[PDB]
């Protein structure tokens, strides 16, 4: 019974998806996020060996001791919603607010964060899950441990090697082949979203707001960014999907070398 096992606290956020609350598991005081998804807004459904939101299927597939992805601890069905119990880092800030408040991140910080996102996305792909909404809003920073967690699998799909013709993630992080043709492959589209994210980190906002900018193929840098970092970004943002790097190519890129450990990242950049 849901209402017995968790103490609900303050609303943490809401939007199209539904609403999420701070909570604590009564059983042992573990911090949790309690996410309410309305059935009316669930577009994609999966099957547990039960009919659940695809989000629940994807979350279960990526569920593990690896911290890089949010863990689903439990879930419940109600008449008009599903309630998902997610583990909650404490203290936490999402990467959107962190960039808003701090501005453009030092490259050493951006490198540590971006590497950790790469590792988390690799984890998803290797678990057969495509996220489809990689953005700063969907990344939490454990501000004490300096560990990042990918959240929000509500636009995700099972990973496949053929084209996707559906998309409900964030348009400004979506690739030019989606804008032009309503078609993309999963991995190359993920790399584009990663390019947007890296630019966001080192410049303090995303490069593109408009469809014409997304398809235009020009990346103007508004901050001083190293040549090596600009190169990586522009490679991730190649207009031709097959010109974009693999995850291996990204992590082998010279700009990605000598990454900080998460605990060093907290010590140098987060503890204040």
């Amino acid at each position: 019974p849901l209402e017995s096992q968790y103490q609900v606290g303050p609303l943490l956020g809401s939007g199209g998806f539904g609403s999420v609350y701070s909570g604590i598991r009564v059983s042992d005081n573990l911090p949790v996020a309690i996410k309410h998804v309305e059935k009316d807004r669930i577009s994609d459904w999966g099957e547990l060996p039960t009919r659940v939101p695809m989000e629940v299927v994807l979350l279960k597939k990526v569920s593990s001791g690896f911290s890089g992805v949010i863990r689903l601890l439990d879930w419940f069905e109600r008449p008009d919603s599903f309630v998902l119990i997610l583990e909650r880092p404490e203290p936490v800030q999402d990467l959107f607010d962190f960039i808003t408040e701090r501005g453009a991140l030092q490259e050493e910080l951006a490198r540590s964060f971006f590497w950790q996102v790469l590792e988390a996305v690799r984890h998803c792909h290797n678990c057969g899950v495509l996220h489809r909404d990689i953005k700063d809003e969907n990344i939490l920073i454990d501000l004490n441990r300096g560990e990042l967690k990918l959240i929000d699998f509500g636009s995700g799909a099972l990973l496949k090697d053929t084209v996707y013709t559906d998309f409900d993630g964030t348009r400004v992080y979506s690739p030019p082949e989606w804008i032009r043709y309503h078609r993309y492959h999963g991995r190359s589209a993920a790399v584009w979203s990663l390019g947007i994210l890296l630019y966001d980190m080192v410049c303090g906002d995303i490069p593109f707001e408009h469809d014409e900018e997304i398809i235009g193929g020009q990346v103007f840098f508004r901050q001083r960014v190293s040549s090596e970092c600009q190169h990586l970004i522009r490679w991730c943002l190649a207009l031709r999907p097959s010109d974009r790097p693999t995850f291996e190519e990204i992590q082998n890129h010279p700009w990605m070398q000598d990454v900080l450990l998460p605990q060093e990242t907290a010590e140098i950049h987060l503890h204040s």
Partner: peptide, 10 residues
């Protein structure tokens, strides 16, 4: 001066 905004996932 330039406005940074969240963007809706849909």
């Amino acid at each position: 001066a330039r406005k940074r905004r969240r963007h809706p996932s849909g």
